[PDB]
């Protein structure tokens, strides 16, 4: 399942020690910022494809992980950074799934060493 | 998965013989009106997603079907057309993710007879 980080010592572990060599989506999200059931939805299926299987989806309150937040510089929520062996590889802002989908293929593509896509 | 339809047997069967008390999604496409990569990978997280395990999902295209298309009086691509048991429960204009889904879960909701949500 995607998972709701509530720590800092769980977020080290689930971004360094435990993330290998897959990609690490950390979605930002405030209560505030709350994107519509529907579009829940949308998101929950795209974590739930099996094409995705090996990549992290880490759900972080931006509010209530303050600590999380300033490290990153959050700005603006809703909002996706994609991390990659313990770099960030590319951040979006907002919550379009089309735009979350193709940053999410780009990121695949720019990890895959041996071949050009 | 998804399937293709071709053939007015095979549409007529996946329609009524074997829908039995599923919920079928009707999606009527044509190459003029292909939505881009990105939000086709957003429909097959939908169709793949294990909460729409009863779900039959059926993709025809609008100009090789014609029959379909007209016996449906389609005048707008893309299109979504759900039906339960041989009726028409709901229509959407469109290919917006989140209206999708929403209309989606509205049917689901409308063939439960035994509990309202």
Do not use: K, M, Q, W
């Given at each position: 399942p995607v998972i709701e980080i509530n720590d800092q010592e769980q977020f080290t572990y689930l971004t360094?020690?435990?993330?290998?060599?897959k990609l690490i989506v950390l979605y930002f999200h405030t209560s505030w910022a709350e994107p519509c059931k529907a579009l829940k939805q949308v998101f929950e299926a795209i974590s739930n494809?099996?094409?995705?299987?090996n990549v992290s989806f880490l759900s972080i309150d931006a509010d209530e992980n303050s600590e999380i937040s300033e490290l990153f510089e959050?700005?603006?929520?809703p909002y996706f950074i994609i991390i990659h062996k313990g770099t960030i590889l590319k951040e979006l802002s907002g919550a379009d799934p089309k735009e979350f989908v193709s940053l999410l293929e780009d990121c695949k593509n720019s990890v895959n060493s041996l071949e050009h896509h």
């Open positions: 360094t020690t435990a993330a290998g060599d494809e099996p094409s995705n299987s959050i700005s603006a929520v």
